[PDB]
């Protein structure tokens, strides 16, 4: 309960900003090309990841950069990470969220940047793309948005401002998008009314990603146990997951945050599951695999119109 102050401190904060931000106090930078986003209102399990992949395969026929958030402070500000498939950096340099999105979108760049209008000028300079992508670029209004994409899950609605709740910003800030995408259809569906273009959003499970990402059946587990384990505190999640798609499970492992399985060595014979925010650490021993999903989106042909517009 005495978190609740802090919230409402924090709502006042974040108001606060958001108006300087509504009335033009506060600039709100453009860039010469189109620019896409991608976000959500709360932290933990979003699912904004799996539609900015989604997002790349609809603009397979144009030159796409992504530009990533790279968090902390050992980056320059700007780093290129990837030259469309071609890795420049390693994994710990770059991060593991932008390394992952490199290597699950071979024909696509990927900058990191904490600021992204840096991030585009050495984009537009070197690699000379068409199109940005912001993944997780709702909250940064710094950087104006053509198309300013939301998502939202069940749980939002529901839900309140840190440190109580998990918002970052208050639900009423939903008014600043442009088209909204309505997730976690798979598990608990809902609809939503604003007037915008709506989405409804699935994720299903369709196979496995084997460590050169390169998607293999996931009959192989069938009539045979695995060995699960996952590198932090996300296991009661994942667990359920496992649960929930009858995979059988003889054993679960945890393993520190910051685990970077420098020393593991796997039993040969025997196959391995587990997050592919851990998989990328994991090339060379060659039987662990990592789950796959994919975004199954209705009225795509919809999407596209709206996105094909934006391009004059």
């Excluded at 904060?13 to 300087?20: E, P, Q, S, V, Y």
Aim: glycine share 6%.
């Amino acid at each position: 309960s005495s978190l609740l102050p802090f919230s409402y401190l924090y709502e006042k904060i974040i108001n606060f900003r958001n108006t300087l931000y509504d009335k033009g106090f506060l600039k709100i930078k453009k860039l010469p090309v189109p620019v896409i986003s991608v976000g959500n209102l709360s932290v933990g399990g979003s699912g904004k990841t799996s539609f900015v992949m989604y997002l790349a395969d609809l603009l397979k026929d144009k030159r796409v950069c992504i530009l990533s958030r790279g968090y902390k402070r050992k980056s320059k500000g700007t780093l290129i990470v990837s030259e469309y498939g071609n890795l420049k950096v390693s994994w710990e340099e770059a991060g593991d969220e932008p390394y992952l999105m490199a290597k699950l979108l071979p024909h696509v760049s990927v900058v990191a940047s904490e600021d992204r209008y840096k991030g585009g000028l050495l984009a537009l300079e070197k690699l000379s793309p068409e199109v940005f992508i912001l993944d997780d670029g709702f909250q940064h209004r710094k950087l104006h948005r053509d198309l300013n994409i939301l998502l939202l899950k069940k749980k939002d609605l529901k839900d309140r401002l840190l440190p109580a709740g998990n918002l970052r910003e208050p639900l009423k800030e939903i008014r600043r998008a442009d088209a909204l995408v309505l997730t976690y259809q798979e598990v608990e569906p809902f609809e939503f009314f604003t007037g915008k273009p709506t989405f409804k959003m699935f994720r299903e499970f369709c196979c496995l990603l084997n460590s050169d990402f390169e998607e293999v059946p996931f009959d192989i587990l069938k009539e045979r146990e695995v060995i699960a384990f996952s590198g932090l505190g996300d296991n009661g999640q994942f667990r359920k997951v496992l649960k929930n798609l009858g995979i059988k499970v003889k054993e679960f492992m945890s393993f520190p945050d910051h685990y970077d399985y420098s020393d593991f060595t796997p039993e040969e014979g025997e196959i391995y599951l587990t997050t592919p925010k851990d998989l990328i650490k994991l090339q060379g021993y060659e039987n662990v695999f990592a789950l796959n999903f994919k975004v199954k989106l209705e009225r795509e042909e919809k999407l596209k119109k709206l996105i094909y517009r934006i391009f004059y």
